[PDB]
Ligand binder design. Structure first.
Ligand SMILES: CCCCCCCCCCCCCCCCCC(=O)OC[C@H](COP(=O)(O)OCCN)OC(=O)CCCCCCCCCCCCCCCCC
Ligand SMILES: CCCCCCCCCCCCCCCCCCCC(=O)O[C@H](COC(=O)CCCCCCCCCCCCCC)COP(=O)(O)OCCN
Ligand SMILES: CCCCCCCCCCCCCCCCCCCC(=O)O[C@H](COC(=O)CCCCCCCCCCCCCC)COP(=O)(O)OCCN
Ligand SMILES: CCCCCCCCCCCCCCCCCCCC(=O)O[C@H](COC(=O)CCCCCCCCCCCCCC)COP(=O)(O)OCCN
Ligand SMILES: CCCCCCCCCCCCCCCCCCCC(=O)O[C@H](COC(=O)CCCCCCCCCCCCCC)COP(=O)(O)OCCN
Ligand SMILES: CCCCCCCCCCCCCCCCCCCC(=O)O[C@H](COC(=O)CCCCCCCCCCCCCC)COP(=O)(O)OCCN
Ligand SMILES: CCCCCCCCCCCCCCCCCCCC(=O)O[C@H](COC(=O)CCCCCCCCCCCCCC)COP(=O)(O)OCCN
Ligand SMILES: CCCCCCCCCCCCCCCCCCCC(=O)O[C@H](COC(=O)CCCCCCCCCCCCCC)COP(=O)(O)OCCN
Ligand SMILES: CCCCCCCCCCCCCCCCCCCC(=O)O[C@H](COC(=O)CCCCCCCCCCCCCC)COP(=O)(O)OCCN
Ligand SMILES: CC(C)CCC[C@@H](C)[C@H]1CC[C@H]2[C@@H]3CC=C4C[C@@H](O)CC[C@]4(C)[C@H]3CC[C@]12C
Ligand SMILES: CC(C)CCC[C@@H](C)[C@H]1CC[C@H]2[C@@H]3CC=C4C[C@@H](O)CC[C@]4(C)[C@H]3CC[C@]12C
Ligand SMILES: CC(C)CCC[C@@H](C)[C@H]1CC[C@H]2[C@@H]3CC=C4C[C@@H](O)CC[C@]4(C)[C@H]3CC[C@]12C
Ligand SMILES: CC(C)CCC[C@@H](C)[C@H]1CC[C@H]2[C@@H]3CC=C4C[C@@H](O)CC[C@]4(C)[C@H]3CC[C@]12C
Ligand SMILES: *[C@@H]1O[C@H](CO)[C@@H](O)[C@H](O)[C@H]1NC(C)=O
Ligand SMILES: *[C@@H]1O[C@H](CO)[C@@H](O)[C@H](O)[C@H]1NC(C)=O
Ligand SMILES: *[C@@H]1O[C@H](CO)[C@@H](O)[C@H](O)[C@H]1NC(C)=O
Ligand SMILES: *[C@@H]1O[C@H](CO)[C@@H](O)[C@H](O)[C@H]1NC(C)=O
Lengths: 344, 344, 344, 344
């Protein structure tokens, strides 16, 4: 049913499942824009395939050949099945557009599934090769931030009654290596390349004459060759090709809307904005240094992932509360922090 | 079965699922009127699609063409499938109303699913882009309110035997920025625009002549062109078009009933009523200031979400009990609060 | 299968599911008579729809038209499907009873599902708009009653070795406002109105001539108009209309049995009986005042919901044990209470 | 499949599900004989319905009409479906036995499902109206018995190193009111009445001539009336009527075996036997009084439910161990109790 496919592929959490494992607990490991680009680019061809054969849009078989009236039921079934299998054998069928449109019309679901798989591959490579590396580091950074917050408020609480910037040094180190960022821009670049190839294929397929689904087929190989009761050629038509083209144009539109999103995603430093650690600079136990910007290096990628997963950090939430209050400038940062009383 | 679709789409918790995650625990993050508008505007086209092809309303195929009596079973099947695929090819079919009604009749389920998806998109954008931002802030506000209540009753209990309005300052800050409110009114405005476009389409479709489902179809392209045994044209009829129109008028009625609800939702300040924090003004540890009204700013949105999710706050419940008792004015607020004894 | 539908709609907990949420834990929030009225009025039309097309009661298609013998299989299928779609087009079919019976016969499942949905709507509005408001208040009242019981037995225990009637004042306040009660009687009144409209429709439908399922149909629009091989008119019959009428009379009987139940439910003060708080009057820490009767106000509704959900209250259970023992009058209330020793 | 229905309706826990709720934990609330009577009287008609249409016992359609040889496939299908729908219209069909056997043959599954539902109704009324009332009281009685046992062994333990019979007074009070017992005998009496009505109907139906499934049917209303190619009348036969009668006699046999069980259940005092509290009379902290017998009052019903659910009571188990040992009379009750050492 149409509504079942709708639920399964947009309303269900299709490709939105969090990693079912206690190693990454609440950690996203895939940027929201990347998760939605993957969800679209993968589920749309699948949702389109499932629609192209919805039981109410499909009239029946995928091909019909119009055997003569003298032909029995089973002879007509033979003609249909033979021509269906004969869209490959170029000698049997004669089509005005060519044999390539026939191949594309028969194997359109396979090609869409191929595009879905190829578009799922880069997110899979990211989830397996580079997601744990960033997950461990991000979990460590969040733990260290919570610890420095607790120590800062404990020092402030003792005042109301070591000191090494380890996380800052770790991020300074991340500023050097660029392995994770080249992995990220490589998976994004393969996603963009496959999306553009899919756009090219879908634009070509939609550009077909729309009469290329009608091909002349001749069951005259083998012992049927010099047979006389069988006519020389049959007029076959590939049903559901109009549906294929109407769905291919939808896929092409969505993909050419998605490609600018991927291209923008490709520029990872430009997206690093709203410096997340700047809110921590108001802590005594934390050095006054953001030092996170301007590079095609893993530091910018970590900045993005921190900007995403930082809302889970309670200390960040309270510090951002104080920072927003500081916009008015009524009281003072350490006083409001001591008032806070939120170690964990 | 009809009853299965009924269960799935009204009696089941379709699109009423709470976010399956411990980040938002009992927090709604979608106003009840917005949740019901989404549920209706999305499930109704899906429920209608599933009904339009219920096994007891569908007689069989979606098209029937009445081949001549001389035609065999398979030749008639070819005529049916050819004309079904030929509602697209404008050269083959001749219809009094035009080819556009034929397109709309064949692809009515697809268009309804498209409307369902487009109507689901703004709630999805709200759930992903702006729901966590409001969720963290609302959870922090509820925690701070419980904390101030506990501190107020502890001070009162010590009397029977810091002091910074942090949440008030946070809300004062929210009064300034308007990012969340423009996100909210933007998703609501896109919902209204898509609902109005769906109303326009459904009113047009229902306005079709009701004989536009009968089209004359000619299987005479290719080698069949100069064939003589095949008649010049066939009288095809698109079954289940009357069902499509009867369901389109239902969808249009429900949508023109839903559009005023969305328009009213669009006026977020007007809906901010029954000042929820006013009940907290009777606490000594809480400054005597509501300061939440009159603006197209995120403060009004936060007021709505607080009015919704505030029933989960135990301190709010007890304070509202005292406030309602105060209507009689028998005793006194601090005495009844000390009697209360409900820290958590 | 018949037995599967039987299980699903009477033997399963259909529409008897407790709210899957920790906000209301064991709280009913829907009076037993209201829950059963909803279950009947909603599941009966669904159970009837599912029966009307049980695979053993359905002979096959919903319509049969008796084409001539010369007509091929596919031509007869065209006649059947055309007339099925032509019960709408009033020009094609000529029926003695009229076109309205034909519409009602084709769309009987849709009309029953519509009645099921409309009858489910008021309980849904109650569950979403007014159920949490009463749930929070009822949970607070139960907690306060358990607390006053514990304090009374602690005072009695200290004797064997504040004092503000907060819940009594809260109920006195509830005695004033009538928002919840007008919401309740409004949902009940809409339920009664929809039940009466369903009774009217089902009584009309069952009153049909029982030969209105036989209609004369003419496939002579379009190019078939002046065709000669096709006969002027076909004798079609809507199968499963007798089943529809036999099920409509069952639905009408059950609904006219249900309507007095809803009318009685409408009189909420009359149903407030067996004063539940009267059992608490034997506590020293509880003022000697029931003060719950005689009004179209939210207090009577709260009395009903307390009478329903009060069995979950342990203190109420023990107090009712003592009250029943007091019928004999052998010992004394405070002595038996001290003996009780059931703080929680 | 037959074996699937067998599993579902005898081997599965069909209608043996414990109440899925923490209010009644291990409490039966339905006497074993009543639970089995309900299970039989409800699942047997359902199991019979599912068997009457098992895919291997059903040859195909439920009716076959033997159109002439000249009739096409679709004309014969029309005759079959018309006569199927025409068992209702008394003018069309002429049967030797009458139209009532035809009605009963077509709607036999519906009538069996109706009997299953009506037989499920009294157990449902008991489970909803009177089960919680007895559940709370029984749980309280079990808790009080465990408490009195603990206090008795604590007094005995202190000897080796208040005093109010509250549960006895509660049962003395139960001896007065008869609301629960009239509810119980009323649900049992409705069960017996419905079982007897089902026996009457099944004995009548099985008494049919077994040729009443063959009826003469005439498709000659409407424009077919004066038609000549259609014969005057068709010989239709309702297949699966022999299966219906063979299953109706099985249902009747099981029901006339079940009716004496229900009649015996109706005599609730006679079933109150093996005085369960008599085992508690050997406790010092428990008064020496059974006081539970001889009445059409709720006390006898509570005696039955205690006899059923008392095995869950650990104190009862240990006391019955001591009572059985006392049959030999070797030692002494208080000494063996002190030896016991089973407070909980
Ligand atoms: C007096 C009670 C009468 C009872 C009648 C009951 C009949 C049953 C009707 C069936 C309804 C379907 C079931 C859906 C129920 C859930 C809807 C709901 O809860 O609506 C609440 C909503 C409140 O609006 P909102 O802006 O959220 O403000 C409230 C909190 N600040 O409500 C609104 O205000 C939104 C819609 C009203 C806007 C005006 C409409 C045109 C302008
Ligand atoms: C991915 C998209 C693939 C589409 C593009 C393929 C490139 C084909 C380019 C060469 C075409 C070619 O060989 O010419 C035709 C033969 O094609 C053929 O017969 C080759 C068939 C093309 C293969 C397409 C089949 C798709 C299979 C994919 C399934 C994947 C499954 C994954 C799970 C000749 O004919 P003509 O038209 O020139 O004749 C009229 C005279 N010019
Ligand atoms: C917005 C995208 C619009 C795309 C339409 C551009 C193509 C126009 C071609 C003529 C219009 C038409 O109806 O004829 C067919 C296209 O129809 C169609 O197939 C148009 C159907 C429109 C579908 C788009 C609706 C949803 C878009 C996004 C949803 C989210 C031609 O057929 P042909 O292409 O074989 O002949 C190649 C001829 N140039
Ligand atoms: C969304 C609602 C879309 C409906 C409105 C589409 C705008 C069409 C306006 C132009 C119409 C047009 O080109 O005129 C007809 C051709 O239409 C055509 O042949 C174009 C076909 C229109 C596309 C509708 C197909 C719906 C596909 C959506 C599927 C989405 C799937 C999502 C999962 C000519 O014919 P005539 O009537 O003038 O001839 C008699 C002489 N005047
Ligand atoms: C309330 C909404 C009522 C809408 C009816 C307004 C249209 C009237 C047109 C004539 C009435 C009729 O029976 O003829 C067909 C409409 O029937 C219909 O299709 C009327 C069926 C009524 C369905 C509404 C019932 C449930 C409404 C909400 C449920 C929740 C015409 O057919 P046409 O429209 O193709 O010809 C275009 C002609 N103006
Ligand atoms: C709810 C129950 C609705 C039933 C009552 C509808 C009111 C109809 C009153 C007007 C009747 C009318 O227009 O007269 C007939 C046309 O009806 C028509 O052709 C109008 C059709 C009536 C609409 C019923 C279709 C039900 C659709 C509901 C589906 C809801 C789906 C929910 C998921 C003319 O004919 P005649 O008999 O006078 O001719 C013989 C000469 N007098
Ligand atoms: C309850 C049944 C109460 C009403 C039944 C009789 C109403 C009077 C007309 C009965 C005539 C009859 O038996 O012939 C057809 C079948 O009726 C029938 O269908 C009569 C028997 C119906 C069996 C219903 C069983 C009720 C079980 C309830 C359990 C809950 C009438 O057909 P028509 O109604 O079109 O003629 C309307 C013209 N007077
Ligand atoms: C429950 C068991 C119901 C069976 C007993 C029904 C009582 C019928 C007594 C009156 C019989 C009657 O009216 O006589 C026949 C008409 O019956 C009829 O045509 C009335 C039809 C009887 C209704 C039975 C249909 C069962 C429907 C129950 C479905 C429940 C669904 C629950 C989900 C006339 O004919 P004749 O034989 O005298 O002609 C030969 C000349 N004497
Ligand atoms: C033990 C119960 C036995 C019931 C049999 C008593 C009826 C005897 C009638 C003649 C025997 C026979 O074979 O003919 C058909 C009954 O067969 C049958 O239908 C007999 C089949 C026996 C089925 C019982 C087996 C399982 C019983 C309990 C299982 C647990 C008559 O057919 P008719 O009754 O239409 O003609 C009415 C004639 N008096
Ligand atoms: C990502 C964006 C740019 C994609 C836009 C669609 C492009 C790729 C589509 C739309 C129209 C298409 C063309 C339509 C027709 C022809 C003629 C044919 O003999 C060769 C292919 C060719 C030349 C197609 C190549 C692909 C094409 C240019
Ligand atoms: C939201 C509310 C206002 C929607 C009401 C339905 C509207 C959009 C519907 C109802 C009747 C419809 C009209 C009916 C007939 C025609 C004639 C046709 O040649 C062009 C479209 C046109 C002019 C339709 C446009 C859309 C229409 C005006
Ligand atoms: C709730 C109770 C009162 C419902 C009882 C059923 C009522 C509503 C039914 C039973 C018989 C029905 C009538 C039977 C026949 C006709 C004649 C027709 O030309 C107009 C409708 C009319 C007049 C029906 C109106 C509805 C009706 C009166
Ligand atoms: C619970 C026990 C007593 C049930 C035993 C089955 C009874 C109810 C059955 C068995 C035989 C049946 C009888 C068989 C034949 C006829 C003749 C018919 O013209 C009227 C009904 C009547 C008179 C039946 C009435 C019901 C009947 C007496
Ligand atoms: C069929 O007959 C033709 C006659 O020209 C001949 O050339 C060909 O070889 C024959 N093929 C078979 C399968 O006999
Ligand atoms: C069919 O015959 C006609 C005769 O006018 C001719 O014009 C046309 O080209 C022929 N087409 C084919 C497929 O041979
Ligand atoms: C059918 O023939 C009749 C003859 O009177 C004519 O009036 C009508 O216009 C014709 N219709 C078509 C579709 O040719
Ligand atoms: C059928 O013909 C007979 C001839 O006596 C006539 O009485 C009857 O009215 C006719 N019915 C129709 C439907 O024309």
């Amino acid at each position: 049913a149409i509504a079942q496919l709708a639920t399964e592929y947009v309303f269900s959490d299709f490709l939105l499942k969090e990693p079912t494992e206690p190693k990454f607990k609440g950690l996203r490991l895939e940027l929201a824009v990347d998760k939605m680009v993957t969800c679209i680019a993968v589920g749309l061809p699948l949702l389109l395939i499932s629609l192209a054969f919805a039981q109410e849009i499909s009239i029946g078989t995928q091909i019909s050949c119009f055997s003569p009236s003298s032909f029995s039921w089973r002879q007509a079934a033979f003609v249909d099945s033979y021509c269906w299998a004969a869209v490959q054998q170029k000698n049997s069928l004669q089509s005005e557009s060519g044999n390539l449109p026939l191949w594309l019309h028969k194997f359109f679901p396979y090609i869409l599934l191929l595009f879905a798989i190829l578009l799922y591959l880069p997110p899979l490579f990211w989830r397996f090769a580079a997601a744990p590396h960033i997950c461990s580091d991000l979990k460590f950074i969040m733990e260290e931030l919570d610890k420095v917050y607790n120590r800062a408020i404990k020092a402030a609480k003792s005042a109301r009654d070591f000191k090494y910037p380890i996380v800052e040094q770790y991020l300074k180190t991340k500023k050097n290596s660029n392995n994770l960022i080249i992995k990220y821009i490589s998976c994004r670049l393969l996603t963009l390349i496959i999306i553009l190839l899919a756009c090219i294929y879908l634009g070509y397929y939609f550009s077909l004459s729309s009469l290329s689904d009608e091909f002349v087929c001749s069951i005259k190989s083998g012992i049927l060759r010099n047979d006389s009761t069988v006519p020389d050629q049959f007029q076959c038509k590939l049903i559901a090709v109009g549906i294929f083209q109407l769905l291919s144009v939808i896929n092409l539109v969505v993909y050419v809307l998605l490609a600018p999103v991927v291209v923008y995603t490709l520029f990872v430093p430009f997206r690093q904005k709203t410096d997340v650690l700047k809110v921590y600079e108001i802590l005594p136990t934390f050095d006054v240094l953001h030092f996170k910007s301007e590079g095609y290096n893993d530091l910018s990628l970590y900045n993005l992932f921190l900007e995403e997963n930082i809302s889970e950090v309670k200390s960040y939430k309270c510090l951002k509360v104080l920072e927003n209050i500081k916009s008015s400038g009524q009281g003072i940062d350490p006083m409001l922090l001591l008032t806070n009383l939120g170690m964990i």
